Amino acid sequence: AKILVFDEAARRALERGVNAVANAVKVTLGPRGRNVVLEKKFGSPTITKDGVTVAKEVELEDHLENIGAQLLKEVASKTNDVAGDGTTTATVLAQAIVREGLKNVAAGANPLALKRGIEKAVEAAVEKIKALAIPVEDRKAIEEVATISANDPEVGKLIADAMEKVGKEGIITVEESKSLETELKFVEGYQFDKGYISPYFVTNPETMEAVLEDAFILIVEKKVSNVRELLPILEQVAQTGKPLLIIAEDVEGEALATLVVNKLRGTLSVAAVKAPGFGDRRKEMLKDIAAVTGGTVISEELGFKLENATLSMLGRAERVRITKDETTIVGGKGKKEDIEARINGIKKELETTDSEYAREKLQERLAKLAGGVAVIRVGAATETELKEKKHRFEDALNATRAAVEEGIVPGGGVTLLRAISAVEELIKKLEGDEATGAKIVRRALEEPARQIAENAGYEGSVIVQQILAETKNPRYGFNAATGEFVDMVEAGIVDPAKVTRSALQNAASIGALILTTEAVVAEKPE
């Protein structure tokens, strides 16, 4: 029992959703976001100033409107997913683009033409972001960036060192130490891009992660779907009192169902994750895990049933962190020999490799194993003070890492504003509805800056003007925090150019999507 909806009817419904999210989220953008209250079904209410936190809690009653909300949240988040920030900024830009877009379409503008224009606009914008970016590759550079985003010259050093040694494609993590001091330690471990097969395996509802400490790592290679072939090992581990991380190529049917039940029951704290990589590439990576873990790849190939698996064929580590997009293994306890075994065998095969693509990938396995897993044990005094430093340091890390990828640009929306000039120049060479699109982007670009100042209790439009007024130094901007105009850079208010380029491109993507939408097939109230 579906329900069809076409043309403006549909686009307007989606927009409604888009606005629901965007309006709740943008009140937090900038140094002085406003408070958003979220109520928990059981616990008492919560108050935030974090866009992502609020975005997660936004779900609308109406199917069609919700579809828009979800659709926005998705594309918006895939910004934080590649730069660890700017998910809220992408939402704001998107709202604007959607609004003006639908307005002009309703006034007779051609959707496709608007799109062609919105795209050309963004290109020009991005190109300005680039030519405006400050590279961060020096030692001092990387440290300073992190030092700021963390607000701790020490953690800055650590983050810098951690990167210095593990490398760009290396592994770095922030762990909640128990000690009251923050230190940097280079343990053994691995990390691949796969996450919990079921959101029920989550340990912490807030962070949406599944944290396992001192657990076994059952490394399978088959599709574990039968309970009978799993109960044996599941039992041995049950009596161990320890948690279990399953890394099969997939866990479905009974298998996955059981794992989830006992997990939510308290019988056994587990978490299933799909095997890293694909094809030949995968078994090779499953071994990399067994090596650093001290377990063995239970492959049906070398003939071996699961039920006959010993509570010793499965390696283990000090801590395992599972995200919906990534699995991390800290404290690998495999034989330092097996590990160096892969590292070398990987280098040998690296000389025999000819395709640049294959090379880069062996490179990452090489950098994961070697260098290992730079860990930043975070010291606190309160469970509270910890969550704080934990978050702060973690972000500072993601920030800095992104910062290195695409340089940095002036923050506080200022970079997006400087992009306007580039869009203006484009418009002068454009005409028709296409030019209108370019104009739409140009208007959008003002929102972030404006919204920040606005949230801070200032006249958005006014500040945005005074900023665009200064043409001398493009780094000239408004620091909504102190309420003064300064050099955003020299004021330590910067953003990973990667984050900005993304938020924009993503927002513009959602916009183009909706303008090009001619129908939506939703589910009728079940």
Ligand X SMILES: Nc1ncnc2c1ncn2[C@@H]1O[C@H](COP(=O)(O)OP(=O)(O)O)[C@@H](O)[C@H]1O
Site for ligand X in 86-125 (CB under 6 A): 86-89
Which has the closest alpha carbon to 404: 129, 128, 142, 82? 142
From the list ligand X, a second copy, Mg ion, none, partner contacted by residue 433 (C-beta under 5 to 8 A by kind): a second copy
DSSP string computed for 401-437:
HHHHHH-EEETTTHHHHHHHHHHHHHHTT--HHHHHH
Q: Is 189 annotated as a binding residue?
A: no
The residue type found at 321 is R
**According to the binding rule CB under 6 A, does residue 51 interact with ligand X?**
yes
**Rounded Cα distance, 406 and 134, in Å:** 8
Q: Of these partners, ligand X, a second copy, Mg ion, none, which one is at the site of residue 219 (CB under 5 to 8 Å by kind)?
A: none
Q: Measured from the CB atom, is 397 or 510 closer to Mg ion? A: 397
- For ligand X, the closer of residues 28 and 296 by Cβ is 28
Per CB under 5 A, which of residues 57..116 are in contact with Mg ion? 85
Query: In angstroms, what CA-CA distances link 260 with 32, 167, 226?
Result: 41, 37, 14
How many residues bind ligand X (CB under 6 A)? The answer is 21
Report how far apart, in Å, the C-alpha atoms of 174 and of each of 66, 165, 183, 333, 395 are. Answer: 35, 16, 10, 19, 10
480 is in an annotated binding site: yes
Cβ-closest residue to ligand X?
A: 411
Smaller CB separation from Mg ion, 331 or 411: 411
Range 369-408 burial, b when 16+ CB lie within 10 A, else e: bbbbbbbbbbbbeeeeebbebbebbbebbbbbbbbbebbb
Give the integer Cα–Cα distance in Å for 136 and 145. Answer: 8
- Is 293 annotated among the ligand-binding residues? no
Amino acid, single-letter form, for residue 381: A
Structure tokens at 42: 């059981």
CB of 141 to a second copy, least distance (A): 31
Strands 210-218 and 244-246 come out as parallel
| Shortest distance in whole angstroms from residue 52 CB to a second copy | 13
Question: Quick one: 136 or 316, whose CB is closer to a second copy?
Answer: 316
**Is 31 labelled a binding residue?**
yes
Flag whether 85 is marked binding: yes
Between 59 and 88, how does the x/- string for binding to ligand X read (CB under 6 A)? --------------------------xxxx
- Binding-site size for Mg ion (CB under 5 A) equals 1
495 is in an annotated binding site: yes
* Coil, strand or helix at 331: strand
Nearer of residues 109 and 452 to ligand X, judged by Cβ: 452
Partner interacting with residue 59 (select from a second copy, ligand X, Mg ion, none; CB below 5-8 Å by kind): a second copy
d(CA 94, CA 503): 9
Long-range Cβ contacts of 71-78 (<8 Å, 24+ apart): 71/14, 71/17, 71/18, 71/510, 71/513, 72/17, 72/18, 72/21, 72/22, 72/510, 73/21, 75/506, 75/507, 75/509, 75/510, 75/513, 76/21, 76/506, 76/507, 76/510, 77/52, 78/506
Nearer to ligand X, 131 or 302 (CB): 131
Whole-number minimum distance, CB 33 to ligand X, in Å? 5
* CB contact at 8 A, 342 and 288: yes
Instruction: Give, as ranges, the residues between 330 and 359 that touch ligand X (CB under 6 A).
Output: none
Out of Mg ion, a second copy, ligand X, none, what residue 4 binds, judged by CB under 5 to 8 A for its kind, is a second copy
Instruction: Answer with the entry of a second copy, ligand X, Mg ion, none that 303 interacts with (C-beta below 5 to 8 A by kind).
Output: none
CB of 173 within 8 A of CB of 328?
A: yes
Candidates 17, 30, 243, 334: give the one binding ligand X (CB under 6 A).
Answer: 30
Q: Which of 363, 467, 471 lies closest to 417 in space, CA to CA? A: 467
Nearer Cβ to Mg ion (85/433): 85
| Cβ count within 10 A of residue 185 | 15
**Closer residue to a second copy, CB minimum distance, 23 or 482:** 23
Report if residue 451 touches ligand X, rule: CB under 6 A: no
The annotation status of 86 as a binding-site residue, yes or no, is yes
Q: For residue 39, what is the enclosing H or E element? A: none
Nearer to ligand X, 148 or 329 (CB): 148
Q: Is 483 in the site for ligand X (CB under 6 A)?
A: no
Using CA atoms, how far apart are residues 146 and 160, in angstroms rounded to an integer?
Answer: 7
Contacts to ligand X from residues 128-157, by CB under 6 A? 148
Which of ligand X, Mg ion, a second copy, none has residue 525 at its interface (CB below 5 to 8 Å by kind)? none
Query: Strand, helix or coil at 44?
Result: coil
Q: How far apart are the first and last CA of the chain?
A: 8
Based on the shown chain and the rule CB under 6 A, indicate whether residue 493 belongs to the binding site for ligand X.
yes
Applying CB under 6 A, which of residues 479, 502, 509, 517 lies at the interface with ligand X? Answer: 479
395 is in an annotated binding site: no
Taking alpha carbons only, the member of 430, 521, 409, 362 closest to residue 119 is 430
Using CB distances below 5 to 8 A depending on partner kind, what does residue 288 bind out of a second copy, ligand X, Mg ion, none? none
By C-beta, is 219 or 452 nearer to Mg ion? 452
Tell me the two tokens of residue 192.
């691949």
CB 408, CB 494: distance < 8 Å: yes
Position 495 contacts ligand X (CB under 6 A): yes
Binding-residue pattern over the window 407 to 426 for ligand X, x denoting contact by CB under 6 A: ----xxx-------------
521 makes contact, choosing from a second copy, ligand X, Mg ion, none, with CB < 5 to 8 Å by partner type, with a second copy
CA distance 25 to 59: 13
Residues near ligand X (CB under 6 A) are 28-31, 33, 51, 85-89, 148, 411-413, 452, 479-481, 493, 495
Residues annotated in a binding site for ATP: 28-31, 49, 85-89, 412, 479-481, 495
Binding-site residues, please? 28-31, 49, 85-89, 412, 479-481, 495
Binding site for Mg ion (CB under 5 A): 85
